[PDB]
Design a protein around this ligand. Structure first.
Ligand SMILES: [Mg+2]
Ligand SMILES: [Mg+2]
Ligand SMILES: [Mg+2]
Ligand SMILES: [Mg+2]
Ligand SMILES: [Mg+2]
Lengths: 196, 222, 125, 226, 233, 204, 212, 195, 195, 196
């Protein structure tokens, strides 16, 4: 798996590959690892698919009940609910989740939650088996307050390299754009990103 | 795998006199080959003219001492400020220790004081609560270095009276508090030389009818 | 290949002489004079540095050799045979003594080891 | 064990503590850890004590024979190469961890050797259980172009850090100074900061205290004449 | 029973004449990966205490929340919450020490080594240690992990016993701490150049220094070092 | 299971003024079972004395080995081996079995016949030499012996005083060890006379 | 450890050694392996020292509550079964106990029950428990008779512990003797094995192998 | 195998050895003689692992018989015991060690003395007045310590041996099917056919 | 414990049970009765793990005695055996199972027939003419298969039982110290004091 | 460890960090992992220091004896000798070696020899624990026929990132330049490369 979330001027963009493997067999080559817990709060999932789906579903339930009572939750609140589940059940979970969301007050925010259940607010985050190969590239190429087109290129180029080297990653590059304008899904196929 | 136990080193020594009792212990606290502290008190005044030390794993040691001090406090509440006698304290500590029979306090406990006739008393416990009144007891790391020396110099073991040649034993004459403290100091000086976990400082608590007194002595810091 | 000479090249003649030993002694007789004198507080060994050519640096050719810090050797006869014996004598002082007892061998025992090596070349194949 | 090596202006110095241990028990309180490979090539050893002693004597023996064979004074690189190839062959089973230092016609040298056969070059080095305490001192006070007097001070201070802070090290400080164009000076018990205080009591027994069953003369002499 | 995932390395500290100093680098490692470079591992409690934490970071964040919650709870029905009945270092430590030992006794530890540094009401210096086993101890110098092996020896050269504390100034103490942090950066493979330092003085109060860097490093001698033995070029 | 503590036993050696002393218990056992009360652990080759603790078969084997080697030494050297030389021989012999060692704790004691200097030495099972001035200890009650020796010992003791010190060091150490005791022997060694004394002790 | 107890004409003899070891290290030579449950009942300690001390002291408390409620001395059968039923609840948890519950009542006479941490409960005439039990059994079996005198029976129990104390490395220190009668137990002193061995050797002529 | 005892009296050595041979579940034989005559005045009993016991005993026997022929002379019990010890001491560091414990009972014709040597599989030799291997000593030594005298007759030794066997038959869980008893004295080796 | 046998003859059931109790290295007792009377005409012998055996047997005894008092009626051997089986079948899936094997010998007063039931620790019940537990059957069943007849007298049954015990005493390695024999018939339960 | 070798127009450059660790303790912070087997044939060492030193020393011996008989060896020949040792003794070795050399005929050449003992001729090679983090960066930034200054910058930037993320790597960045002109050693200190 290769997943990342990047903040930029207008908000935040989540990016992910689509490969799910059982050993060396690709069980699903068109997986959707970008999942929605609220209207403008999404997450990237890595680790146990069963665990991360179970967690995400519980979070979506919590934020839905939150919204009914207290109105729209912050991205920080969503990250806290993820953390609470991951931290308290650390012995029985294998989940690496990146939380990304757009407020109007706070704008684009990114939180990463690694295995332990800790929380780290970052300008951008990378995770999954394929992320190891692009720590150098992402650190050198990331800038704050990029444009939408620049951020899409940054994520596309980053995940392209992660896919190139990581056998556990592959397929299409999915992306979800979170801004004041709304929610935009993007997809990029092998013939496009491999030649980069 | 998580290991809930550890070894904080240290060595303690309890000696019962005729009308007094001493409980001594070094002040060094260690893990593996590192020194945590050169002065970390290990022998404690628990009230009612009782002194205590729980040597071994310091976290269990501190927990037990804390719980016993608490037991002394509640003994006063429940029984009209009655003085907890050393024999009663000993039986109480057995139950505290045996209470965790299947997840023991990893310590070797010694208490000292005076019995109800005013004579010197020392009690020795194993980790799970078996105990016994004793005249002389070293505990901890350098216990094997100290006890044989005490058998020889306190109880006069293997010592016979010159001229008789093995026929008459050396008589068991009573030792003064000054004489005991000399043997305690020499025991720890010798233990410091030959045991790496022993050193830094020696703290002795002396119990008499007048109360509890403290004495401190330097030990080699290497 | 293989050393197929597994038999003795030194043998008793009818008269009881060991020819090759006698002939070796004859080669020693032709060799340059060397001597040794023992004093009460020391020993001296000496020999002539017979230079084969004046262009040759006779300092590089050591006829007198240190075997141990307290033992020295000099010879008469064939120089190359001496040189290899010194090498063996130095090594045997370590392997069969110093590495066992942690000290250098006494003169008589090192001599005994050198003698043994020379005896074996008189009987071996 | 705490052992260090420090380079300086015209040579190199090595130092060591003097405590040898059997688990938590101190076997020898004044152990000699500075070993001689050759007159001007010395080394200090940590780990398995028999292996360090044995491997230095073996290489020291072969170095001597090599020196006689070549009519040249032995080099540190030769000791280094012979040690590492021997230790590598035995794949770490010979538990010798050494700091090798010395002077030769090439100059002054300082190397460390690990049990598996790996070697390192440096201006300052430390080995043993007190190596971290010693290296802390070395990293705090080391500089380029140290004098002989500064290097001895630094080396012994690094050993002291091990003596006081490491339980595996103690007692005294041994030092050996190897300067170029000079005899190496072995300074046994250079520092003595751990003398035992006088005991409170004498434990000399009265004669006849011990009970005896039998007495006899042992014959240590040879078989006698007549 | 767990295993630590995201970890923090050495915390080092020492007493001086008027107070205590404590320091810790800003790194959150993920095994050999130096993952997070902006992690604050010194957490102040009030204006008189700083808790330095090493080990598992997720447990550190949990402990951080307990201390934040402790301050809130202390203020409840407490008119003297900012005066006589404010939180002392000794109260904060004993609370943590209780939790740590309870958690180890349930075979579910907080995978940390903690140093509580502060100054008491009467001006006394407070410096005490506690870890995942609930083991506690106090000393003029305290350090966790690699700090115990490398920092303590250096800090003990300044304050070797109790009697050296009044003789040690804040400038000398801070100098020793900063040097120790440099030594750890040279020699600890799980350390970073960036660190935080906190001083708690009985007169000048709590001084918290962020974004410090290891400086005055010696590397020039590396150019002369060639090969691993025989190599000259 | 542990070869060095199957049979049990102890040896201690001390230096005095112009004299050395070496002593040992007499027990041989099979773990808990006492088998022999006459198993002496001290041997001598000329004027050099050797104590050996540990696995009893190896104690016996090494004694036979050093008798063998010191006999050949004497024939070739035309003189009895010295303590300093013998110590190196013991070390060499143990290390040649580096990866299959004799499970023993040897102790050398003796006086150099030429210099008159008292000498003692100890070894680990693998040959590492411990050359202490004061005393050497070995066996299943070595900790106890270290404690006794460290407190009881003082330098330059006369032969008859040294006897009392080493005897009390051995006896009281053995009484705190289950696998040591069942009798004891003490050798008092001077430059040209040696006295051997059997001690009376508890037999449990 | 070596502990024994046997029934005879005059009641019960109980005899134990005094040594306590942690591996090869002799922790104590002055350990009490006879628990005085009450003035009429005795128990021996082998295996776990704490387990035997704690639960036999507890047994005394149960026996006291029995005779308060029932206004009658508890039987040795009932007393032993309280202990065996208790340890049987803990079976598997790791209790280590090997004991003889000894007593002398009207209805039963002199009675000995061997009780075990495996839940075993055996009535018998002669029992030996501990690392040196086999040595004590030999002396007992060859010299035991029902019509022994109180003096001779006491000596037999003493001599049997001495036999074990000599041979068994984990037994020794001193011998504690007890004589159990219907009116209660009677303590017959602490006997140092060191002094006892030489005394017995000379007077009896035994242990000729040992030099004295 | 199981139980082997030995006792040295005034003028002879008596060896008692069990007759049972068990192979797991069943007792295959109840009349097995666990001993070999090494020389006219030297007998060796043995117990240990199956196969190794007899293989070792016969190997020793052959070697002593070879020595007897070569020199036309009987080795002393001490000499034989030292030879046996060395073989076992050699064996313990081998690829597959002999798992064999032995007692060597011999009468020294030179010194006119009986001698009993106990040697275990490690090569641990001891000269004793009485000895055993395995658990046999645990039951019997207390009786031997009590009753034994160095000036005992052969008949008294046999009576003390009967008492030892009776204690074994009472307290041992295993049925060793009694013992074969042999006496070694100045006249040689003979078997007590009724015991 | 070790060996327990059972044989159902014409008009009675005979149970033979060993007397030995061995706790490790020593035989602590040689007169142990490994049986309990459940009711006047029903006897149960038992063998298995220490403590569990007697605890189980006495628990069953108490329950059958309780039933006898409540109903003033003796349960049939079949009914008792079914109750015992269920307890063992319940036990095998417990936290700590009873490790106990039993034989239940009873005389049914209604049917005027002897009955022998064999139940192992798993709750495996079988009604048999003759039975055993552990290794006892391996030695004895070939003899019982050969000699047994359903019309045997009690005296003939005892003779066949002696032959079984003799074969056990010959070929078993363990000394089980003989057997206590008890007979269950119309008149109740009695012990054969000489065997 | 972070090591690499890069071919360029004028020849080849070897690069390496200087950190050697025993667990988390830095046993040597100024290690020289660039080692010489012949005048213009060098190698980068990763894995067991004992193994890679032993191998390198044997190779140096083989190439010295080769030169005495047959003249200067090719870089391919040197790589073959490395391979032969690593492949035949694969069960007892933990060595990852990059071989780099300069001929006049062949110019700059780079061969990598991973754990197995296989050989791979490449335009550039990266290896060691720190190499994982710069696969993306190096693939995106490498060009063939770079200049000396460009190649030095490429290696400096690459190893800078490897050092930044890999705790097992650190210290100084050592480099060795192999061209027709000769052999040039370069060193770059933390204050220089960290700010990149
Ligand atoms: Mg290797
Ligand atoms: Mg003893
Ligand atoms: Mg004993
Ligand atoms: Mg034997
Ligand atoms: Mg780094």
């Amino acid at each position: 798996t290769s997943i990342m979330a990047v903040t930029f001027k207008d908000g935040v963009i989540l990016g992910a590959d689509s490969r799910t493997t059982t050993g060396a067999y690709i069980a699903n080559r068109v997986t959707d690892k970008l999942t929605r817990v609220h209207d403008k709060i999404w997450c990237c999932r890595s680790g146990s698919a069963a665990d991360t789906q179970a967690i995400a579903d519980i979070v979506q339930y919590h934020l839905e009940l939150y919204t009914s009572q207290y109105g729209t939750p912050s991205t920080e609140t969503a990250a806290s609910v993820f953390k609470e589940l991951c931290y308290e059940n650390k012995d029985n979970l294998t989940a690496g989740i990146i939380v990304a969301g757009y407020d109007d007050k706070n704008k684009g925010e990114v939180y990463t939650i690694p295995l332990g259940g800790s929380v780290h607010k970052l300008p951008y985050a990378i995770a999954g088996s394929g992320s190891t190969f692009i720590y150098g590239y992402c650190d050198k190429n990331f800038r704050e307050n990029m444009s939408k087109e620049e951020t899409v290129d940054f994520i596309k180029h980053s995940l392209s390299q992660a896919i190139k080297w990581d056998g556990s990653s592959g397929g299409v590059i999915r992306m979800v754009v979170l801004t004041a304008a709304g929610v935009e899904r993007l997809i990029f196929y092998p013939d496009e990103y491999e030649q980069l | 795998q998580f290991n809930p136990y550890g070894d904080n080193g240290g060595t303690i020594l309890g000696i019962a006199g005729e009308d007094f009792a001493v409980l001594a212990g070094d002040t060094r606290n260690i893990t593996d080959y590192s020194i945590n502290s050169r002065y970390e008190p290990k022998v404690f005044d628990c009230g009612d003219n009782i002194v205590m030390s729980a040597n071994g794993f310091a976290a269990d040691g501190d927990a037990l001492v804390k719980r016993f001090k608490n037991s002394v406090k509640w003994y006063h509440f429940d029984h009209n400020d009655k003085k907890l006698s050393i024999n009663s304290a000993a039986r109480n500590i057995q139950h505290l220790l045996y209470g965790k029979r299947f997840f023991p306090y990893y310590v070797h406990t010694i208490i000292a004081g005076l019995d109800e006739d005013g004579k010197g008393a020392v009690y020795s416990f194993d980790p799970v609560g078996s105990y016994e009144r004793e005249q002389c007891r070293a505990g901890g790391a350098a216990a094997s270095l100290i006890m044989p020396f005490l058998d020889n110099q306190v109880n006069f073991k293997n010592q016979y009276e010159p001229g008789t040649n093995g026929k008459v034993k050396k008589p068991l004459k009573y030792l003064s508090v000054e004489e005991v403290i000399k043997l305690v100091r020499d025991s720890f000086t010798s233990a410091t030389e030959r045991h790496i976990q022993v050193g830094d400082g020696l703290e002795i608590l002396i119990v008499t009818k007048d109360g509890v007194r403290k004495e401190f002595y330097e030990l080699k810091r290497d | 290949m293989t050393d197929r000479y597994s038999f003795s090249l030194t043998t008793f003649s009818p008269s009881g002489k060991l020819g090759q030993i006698d002939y070796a002694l004859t080669a020693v007789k032709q060799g340059v004079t060397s001597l040794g004198i023992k004093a009460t507080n020391g020993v001296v060994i000496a020999t002539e540095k017979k230079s084969s050519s004046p262009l040759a640096m006779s300092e590089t050719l050591s006829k007198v050799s240190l075997l141990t810090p307290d033992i020295g050797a000099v010879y008469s006869g064939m120089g190359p045979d001496y040189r290899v014996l010194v090498d063996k004598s130095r090594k045997v002082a370590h392997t069969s003594y110093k590495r066992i007892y942690g000290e250098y061998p006494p003169t008589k025992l090192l001599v005994s080891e050198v003698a043994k090596i020379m005896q074996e070349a008189t009987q071996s194949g | 064990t705490t052992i260090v090596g420090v380079k300086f202006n015209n040579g190199v110095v090595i130092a060591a503590d003097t405590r040898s241990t059997q688990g938590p028990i101190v076997a020898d309180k004044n152990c000699a850890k500075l070993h001689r490979i050759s007159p001007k090539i010395w080394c200090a050893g940590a780990g398995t004590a028999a292996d360090t002693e044995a491997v230095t004597q073996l290489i020291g023996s072969n170095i001597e024979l090599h020196s006689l064979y070549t009519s040249r004074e032995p080099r540190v690189v030769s000791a280094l190469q012979m040690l590492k190839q021997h230790l590598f062959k035995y794949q770490g089973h010979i538990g010798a961890y050494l700091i090798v230092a010395g002077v030769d016609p090439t100059g002054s040298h300082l190397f460390s050797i690990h049990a598996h056969g790996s070697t390192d070059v440096g201006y300052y080095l430390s080995l043993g259980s007190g190596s971290l305490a010693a290296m802390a001192v070395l990293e705090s006070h080391w500089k380029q172009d140290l004098t002989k007097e500064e290097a001895i001070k630094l080396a012994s201070d690094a050993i002291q850090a091990g003596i006081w802070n490491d339980l595996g090290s103690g007692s005294n400080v041994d030092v050996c100074v190897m300067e170029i164009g000079k005899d190496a000076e072995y300074l046994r018990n250079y520092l003595t900061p751990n003398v035992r205080e006088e005991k409170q009591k004498s434990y000399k027994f009265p004669r006849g205290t011990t009970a005896v069953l039998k007495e006899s003369i042992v014959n240590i002499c040879d078989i006698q004449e007549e | 029973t767990q295993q630590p995932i995201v970890t923090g390395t050495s915390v080092i500290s020492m007493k001086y004449d008027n107070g205590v100093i404590i320091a810790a680098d800003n790194l959150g490692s993920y095994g050999s990966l130096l993952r997070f470079n902006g992690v604050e591992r010194l957490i102040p409690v009030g204006d008189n205490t700083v808790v330095g934490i090493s080990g598992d970071i997720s447990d550190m964040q949990h402990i951080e929340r307990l201390l934040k919650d402790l301050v809130t709870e202390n203020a409840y029905d407490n008119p003297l919450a900012d005066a006589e009945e404010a939180l002392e270092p000794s109260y904060i430590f004993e609370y943590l020490a209780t939790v740590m030992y309870q958690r180890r006794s349930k075979m579910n530890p907080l995978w940390n080594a903690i140093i509580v540094a502060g100054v008491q009401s009467n001006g006394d210096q407070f410096l005490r240690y506690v870890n995942l086993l609930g083991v506690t101890y106090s000393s003029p110098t305290l350090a966790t992990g690699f700090g115990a092996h490398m920092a303590n020896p250096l800090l003990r050269k300044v304050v070797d016993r109790e009697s050296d504390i009044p003789k040690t100034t804040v400038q000398v103490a801070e100098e020793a701490i900063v040097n120790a942090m440099r030594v750890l950066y040279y020699r600890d493979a799980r350390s970073s150049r960036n660190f935080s330092l906190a001083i708690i003085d009985k007169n000048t109060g709590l001084t918290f220094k962020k974004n410090l860097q290891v400086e005055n490093m010696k590397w020039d001698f590396a150019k002369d070092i060639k090969g691993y033995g025989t190599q000259k070029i | 299971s542990d070869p060095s503590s199957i049979n049990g036993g102890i040896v201690v050696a001390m230096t005095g003024k112009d004299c050395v002393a070496i002593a040992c218990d007499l027990r041989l056992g099979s773990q808990s079972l006492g088998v022999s009360n006459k198993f002496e652990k001290i041997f001598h080759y000329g004027h050099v004395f050797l104590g050996i603790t540990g696995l009893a078969t190896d104690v016996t084997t090494l004694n036979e080995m050093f008798r063998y080697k010191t006999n050949l030494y004497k024939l070739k050297e035309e003189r009895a081996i010295e303590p300093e030389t013998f110590t190196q021989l013991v070390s060499s012999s143990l290390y040649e079995r580096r990866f299959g060692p004799y499970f023993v704790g040897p102790v050398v004691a003796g006086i150099n016949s030429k210099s008159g200097k008292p000498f003692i030495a100890g070894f680990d099972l693998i040959g590492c030499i411990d050359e202490a001035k004061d005393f050497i200890v070995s066996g299943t009650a070595s900790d106890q012996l270290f404690g006794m020796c460290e407190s009881l010992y003082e330098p330059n003791l006369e032969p008859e005083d040294l006897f009392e010190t080493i005897s009390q060091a051995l006896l009281n150490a053995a009484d705190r060890d289950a696998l040591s005791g069942w009798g004891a022997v003490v050798y008092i060694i001077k430059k040209d006379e040696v006295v051997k004394r059997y001690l009376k002790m508890r037999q449990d | 450890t070596t502990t024994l107890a046997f029934r005879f004409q005059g009641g019960i003899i109980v005899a134990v050694d005094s040594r306590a070891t942690a591996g090869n290290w002799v922790a104590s030579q002055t350990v009490k392996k006879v628990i005085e449950i009450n003035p009429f009942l005795l128990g021996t300690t082998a295996g776990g020292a704490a387990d035997c001390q704690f639960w036999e002291t507890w047994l005394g408390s149960q026996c006291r509550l029995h005779e308060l409620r029932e206004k009658e001395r508890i039987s040795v059968a009932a007393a032993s079964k309280i202990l065996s039923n208790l340890v049987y609840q803990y079976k598997g948890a790791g209790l280590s106990m090997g004991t003889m519950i000894c007593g002398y009542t009207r209805k039963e006479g002199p009675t000995i029950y061997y009780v075990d941490s495996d839940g075993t409960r055996l009535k018998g005439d002669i029992f030996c428990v501990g690392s040196g039990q086999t040595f004590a059994y030999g002396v007992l079996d060859s010299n035991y008779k029902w019509d022994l005198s109180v003096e001779d029976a006491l000596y037999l129990g003493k001599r049997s512990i001495l036999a074990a104390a000599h041979r068994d490395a984990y037994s020794g220190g001193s011998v504690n003797l007890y004589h159990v009668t219907e009116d209660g137990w009677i303590y017959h002193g602490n006997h140092d094995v060191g002094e006892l061995f030489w005394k017995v050797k000379e007077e009896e002529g035994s242990f000729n192998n040992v030099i004295g | 195998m199981d139980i082997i005892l030995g006792i040295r009296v005034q003028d002879s050595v008596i060896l008692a050895s069990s007759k049972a041979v068990t192979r797991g579940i069943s007792v295959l034989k109840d009349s097995d003689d666990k001993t070999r005559q090494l020389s006219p005045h030297t007998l060796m009993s043995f117990a240990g692992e199956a196969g190794d016991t007899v293989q070792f005993a016969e190997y020793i026997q052959a070697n002593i018989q070879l020595y007897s022929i070569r020199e036309d002379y009987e080795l002393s019990p001490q000499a034989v015991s030292s030879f046996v010890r060395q073989e076992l001491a050699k064996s313990i560091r081998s690829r597959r060690p002999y798992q064999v414990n032995v007692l060597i009972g011999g009468y020294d014709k030179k010194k006119n003395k009986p001698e009993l040597y106990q040697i275990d599989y490690l090569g641990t030799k001891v000269e004793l007045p009485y000895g055993a291997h395995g658990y046999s000593g645990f039951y019997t030594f207390s009786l031997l310590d009590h009753h034994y005298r160095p000036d005992m007759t052969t008949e008294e030794g046999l009576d003390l041996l009967k008492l030892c066997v009776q204690e074994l038959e009472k307290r041992m869980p295993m049925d060793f099917k009694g013992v074969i008893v042999k006496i070694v004295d100045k006249d040689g080796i003979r078997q007590v056919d009724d015991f």
